[PDB]
């Protein structure tokens, strides 16, 4: 399923490098509420990897006999 494409761009548009980032919302004085309830957690320590469609998406190979 490729037409001289389908290597370094997502099927259709990607919105990752187009992403509207987090909105740290300011609550008034004493108006806080449970910040999270689940998976909503990211380890920021990473990268910057081949961010966007600039990464070898093909399988990183390994030596063979």
């Amino acid at each position: 399923s490729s037409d001289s494409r389908y290597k370094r761009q997502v099927s259709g548009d990607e919105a990752y490098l187009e992403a509207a980032p987090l909105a740290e919302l300011h609550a008034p004085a004493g108006m806080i509420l449970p910040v999270t309830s689940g998976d909503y957690a990211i380890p920021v320590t990473n990268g910057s990897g081949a961010v966007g469609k600039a990464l070898d998406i093909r399988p990183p190979a390994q030596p063979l006999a």
Binding site: M31, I32, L33, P34
Partner: protein, 86 residues
């Protein structure tokens, strides 16, 4: 304008018994039991609880009993009121 509508209703199905029974201090355990899963409190603020019912058939009338409740941080049946039928 259609001459009539199907009726619409909402939660907090109760009885006049269900109000005559409980009273101040009664623990949220007992109250949430004898009155059922309480379906209305504030995500932020005091331990204040609400029982509200409404029924609107075919463009006529209003059946709006709105029972507000509070407990304390510990949970004490306290600071209670309903406004029935709007």
């Amino acid at each position: 304008r259609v001459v009539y509508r199907p009726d619409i209703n909402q939660g907090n199905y109760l009885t006049a018994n269900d109000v005559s029974k409980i009273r101040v201090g009664m623990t949220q355990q007992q109250v949430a039991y004898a009155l059922g899963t309480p379906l209305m409190s504030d995500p932020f603020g005091t331990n204040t609880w609400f029982y509200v019912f409404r029924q609107q058939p075919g463009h006529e009338g209003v059946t709006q009993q709105t029972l507000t409740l509070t407990f304390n941080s510990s949970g004490v049946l306290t600071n209670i009121d309903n406004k029935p039928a709007l």
